[PDB]
Amino acid sequence: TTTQNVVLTKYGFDKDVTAIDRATDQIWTGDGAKPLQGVDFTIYNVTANYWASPKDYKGSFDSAPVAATGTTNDKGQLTQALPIQSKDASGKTRAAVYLFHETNPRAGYNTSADFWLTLPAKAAADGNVYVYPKNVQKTTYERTFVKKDAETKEVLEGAGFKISNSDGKFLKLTDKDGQSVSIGEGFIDVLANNYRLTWVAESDATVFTSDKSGKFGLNGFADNTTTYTAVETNVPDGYDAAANTDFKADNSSSDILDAPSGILP
């Protein structure tokens, strides 16, 4: 009838740093790493799969009941009480086995490998069981643009843009769950906000808007080889639209000029 608290902590390290494994009885603060928030896990009860044939068990959670779901908090943690005993396929009580399956990694990180364990596990001094799945940071790319008045060369606020790809689809940012978000002016930190880049019809696209510094753009691009196009869709009054701007997510910044509209006598 008793349970054990499993505490899962998700730490991100620098791209060239591979953290050493920590046992379940070690409370580890992650020295040198950032706790990763918003990472989704499903915990499967694989007791029946495992006990069907222990020596053959290799992490299948096919037909396994969901024991729990969770999402890491600001400390990169989720905690779940799990029954230490559970039934096998025939209804016989066994030591429980649980499989942790990451379903939604944080933007900018690779997904971690499935892992499983039998309960009761060796617990720390506080009675909790600590697990630390490894999340390898991936390289992502960004792009910055600066809107300027072509005549004065001064930065220009409030020009709205959409971004399209070679398929003629347009960029829409969503939250980690695919839901719409309200995107403001300036450079959008997809990585810090755990957003997602999606490609949709033009009318559903996200509008990026130059801020007080003329800046807009975003990070979180998957590569630096794909060509996109920035298309000015909201031109400040008194200006002519810029020509479309082809670009790659190459971490650069570049200017986009708006020519003042001419007025003839």
Author numbering: 38 to 302
Show the paper's wording.
Crystals of full-length GG-SpaA protein belonging to the monoclinic C2 space group diffracted up to 1.9 Å resolution at a synchrotron source (BM14, ESRF). Crystals for full-length GG-SpaA contain three molecules in the asymmetric unit, where the head of one molecule faces the tail of another. Each GG-SpaA molecule is made up of two Ig-like domains connected by a short linker with an interface area of 641 Å2. The two domains are bent by a hinge angle31 (i.e., the angle between the principal ellipsoid axes of the domains) of 152°, in which the N- and C-terminal domains (N-domain and C-domain) consist of residues 39–175 and 176–302, respectively. The electron density map clearly shows continuous density for two intra-domain isopeptide bonds, one for each domain. Formation of the isopeptide bond (K-N) in the N-domain occurs between Lys47 at the end of β-strand A and Asn172 at the end β-strand G, which corresponds to the pilin motif found near the domain interface. On the other hand, isopeptide bond formation in the C-domain is between Lys184 from β-strand A and Asp295 from β-strand G, and involves a proximal catalytic Glu269 in a hydrophobic pocket made by Tyr276, Phe198, Ile293, Phe182, Phe245, Phe253, Ala196, and Leu193. Intriguingly, the three molecules present in the asymmetric unit of the GG-SpaA crystal are seen to generate what resembles a pilus-like fiber, and where the corresponding pilin molecules are in a “head-to-tail” arrangement that may reflect its native biological state. Along the axis of the pilus structure, each of the GG-SpaA molecules shows a rotation angle of ~120° and translation of ~78 Å. The inter-domain hinge angle (152°) in each GG-SpaA molecule and the head-to-tail positioning of adjoining molecules allow for the formation of an elongated spiral staircase-like arrangement that could then offer both flexibility and rigidity to SpaCBA pilus structure.
